Amino acid sequence: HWGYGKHNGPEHWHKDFPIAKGERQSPVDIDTHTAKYDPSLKPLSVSYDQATSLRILNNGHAFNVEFDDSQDKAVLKGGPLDGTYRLIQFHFHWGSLDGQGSEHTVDKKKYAAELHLVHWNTKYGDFGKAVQQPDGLAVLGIFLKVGSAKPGLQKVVDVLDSIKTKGKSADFTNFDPRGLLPESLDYWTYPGSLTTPPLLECVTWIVLKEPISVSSEQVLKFRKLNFNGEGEPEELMVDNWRPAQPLKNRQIKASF
Ligand SMILES: O=S([O-])[O-]
Ligand SMILES: [Zn+2]
Fold first, then answer.
1. Cα(195) to centroid(ligand 1), Å
2. Nearest CA owner, ligand 1 atom 1
3. Integer angstrom CA distances of residue 80 from 125, 127, 136, 245, 254
């Protein structure tokens, strides 16, 4: 099965998912001198006051915080988006070391981790239908740098103990995604895909300029998770990041 090891790593995915070599693959390197300031791009609109977190799950490649997406409770609009995108889940990508973890890179600079807030276009009625469309998904990308602790993240840090191995889930209600957002909403956008199999090219990437800082110890607990199921040989959940893919003439636009 696909994973991040030498035998089932990103360099092998193409065999099972040929799209791996597609035209709008993610992630990419964000070259700051090359991105284009586009003045016709609107401010992002993040309405998360009504978000309904449900549970946290270890799915073997990361941990997903899942939300009730049966109604327009936590949504994203504006920016380069047309229509309403409902928040479904959020997860991270992190490294074995603080000098790596992020998927996206800024001027070839890698951050300690990358937060992904996954949203789906509501005119397609369900997540499953949306991944089949060019504009089915909106993914908010936030970088993590090691510094001071992030208040807002501790609730997550605390439950990781209960979902140590693959297939474990925990109740995780009343969690507010707002405590994960940076002050500024300045962004870069490009059309890309899912960063994990099936790597479908259904994403409008929205990558935030301003990183959020988290402490060493916060980051250390992510690294305690296991890719493996319970009663199996232990394999620490580390470096679950896909390297940068060719931009192939796509244009990266900037809101600033
Ligand atoms: O949401 S991204 O990792 O496919
Ligand atoms: Zn992701």
1. 4
2. 194
3. 20, 20, 13, 22, 10
